[PDB]
Amino acid sequence: IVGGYTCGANTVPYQVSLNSGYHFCGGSLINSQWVVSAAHCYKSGIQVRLGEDNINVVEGNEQFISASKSIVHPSYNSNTLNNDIMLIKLKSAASLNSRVASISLPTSCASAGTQCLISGWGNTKSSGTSYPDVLKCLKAPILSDSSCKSAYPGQITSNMFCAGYLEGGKDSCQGDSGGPVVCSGKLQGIVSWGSGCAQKNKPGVYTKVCNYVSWIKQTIASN
Ligand SMILES: [Ca+2]
Numbered sequence: 001i002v003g004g005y006t007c008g009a010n011t012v013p014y015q016v017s018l019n020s021g022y023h024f025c026g027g028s029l030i031n032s033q034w035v036v037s038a039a040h041c042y043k044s045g046i047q048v049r050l051g052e053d054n055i056n057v058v059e060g061n062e063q064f065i066s067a068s069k070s071i072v073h074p075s076y077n078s079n080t081l082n083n084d085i086m087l088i089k090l091k092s093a094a095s096l097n098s099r100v101a102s103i104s105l106p107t108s109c110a111s112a113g114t115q116c117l118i119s120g121w122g123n124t125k126s127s128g129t130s131y132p133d134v135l136k137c138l139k140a141p142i143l144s145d146s147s148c149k150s151a152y153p154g155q156i157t158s159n160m161f162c163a164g165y166l167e168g169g170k171d172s173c174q175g176d177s178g179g180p181v182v183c184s185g186k187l188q189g190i191v192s193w194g195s196g197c198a199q200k201n202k203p204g205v206y207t208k209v210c211n212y213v214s215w216i217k218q219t220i221a222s223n
Contacts, residue, residue, distance in 0.1 A: 001118065002126050002198040003170035004138035009053035010061060012119045012135060014103035014180060014187075017049040018088075019064075026120040026179025028187050029102050032093040034220055037178035038190050038207065039076040039086040046070065048090055051100045055121055056133045061099045066091045071219060073212070082157045084192040084207045086178075087219055105217070106186040109210035112144040116163055116183035118204075120191060122175030126168070126198040131175060138172065140164045142183070143203060151201055159211050161189065164203035172204045173197035181206050 016027040016035055025041035027048065035048055051061035069089040076083045094100055110116070118138045124130050140163045148162035156162070163181060164171050172179070172191045181189030189206030196202060209216075 001120055001122060001136035001138045001176055002124055002173050004136045007119055007135045007137035009059070010051065010099035012117075012137065012180075013051070013099050013101035015052070015119050015135060017052050017055055017121060018178065019047045019049050020045045023055050023121055023175070025175070025177045026191060027088065028180040029094065029100070030105060030187065030216070031102050031220070032096055033090050035088040035090065036187065036190065036209075036216065037086050037088060038084045038192055039072045040078065040081060040084055040192070041178040042070060042072050042086055046088060048088065050094055053135055054133045063094055063100060065094060069223060071223065073215070080155070080157070081193050082159055085190055085209070085212055087216065089223060103180060103182060103187045104185065105213050106188055106210045109208065110142055110183045110188045112142050114142045114183045116140055116142060116181045116188060118163070118172050118176070118179070118181050118191065120172060120176030120179035122177070123173040123197060126196065138170055140170065148203070148205070151203055152205065156205065159208050160192065160205050161208050162203045162205055163189065166201055166203060168198050168200040168202070171198035
């Protein structure tokens with residue numbers, strides 16, 4: 001996250017880190033056995049880390065649970081990043097309290113202008129590299145479909161939305177991928193892509209979760 005703020009330990013209790021020897025993507029906990037992330041985060045050898053604040057220090061709230069099954073969306077296209085969403089089933093159910101908690105799925109698609117919270121352990125610089133040890137947070141609005149399509153002509157599908165600032169300076173970034181965009185207490189987006197980070201006229205693009213609720217609910221019910 002570029003231009004954001006230190007969230008505070010366990011203020012984002014649905015946030016997960018996906019770890020394959022090191023942190024490589026975020027995710028969101030949607031119930032005690034399932035995590036949602038980006039299909040472009042797919043890897044074998046995934047451990048899910050819950051209740052994390054500092055990813056380099058075991059502080060006490062953490063649960064580390066291996067994945068038993070991964071399900072990339074059946075129509076995911078790695079060239080266009082259309083349908084950039086994946087589900088990960090945990091080997092055992094997480095213990096849910098106040099510092100590990102699930103986030104609800106939306107029942108409606110959120111409007112342009114809605115303020116959302118984005119979080120992750122990704123790069124904090126628009127030029128160069130600095131990865132934080134603690135979770136960063138960013139408040140950003142959803143942009144209109146027309147401003148999104150003008151920032152990225154011919155690249156935005158009905159399964160994506162833009163959020164952030166056209167003036168640049170504040171954005172998600174590499175290493176935030178797969179992580180949550182939460183608006184009005186629901187998971188509306190998944191960190192997906194963008195051109196660099198926090199560049200003028202190049203806001204972040206997110207998977208539009210409201211389009212996938214049926215697939216998610218049916219998949220969870222059957223696996
Ligand atoms: Ca930790």
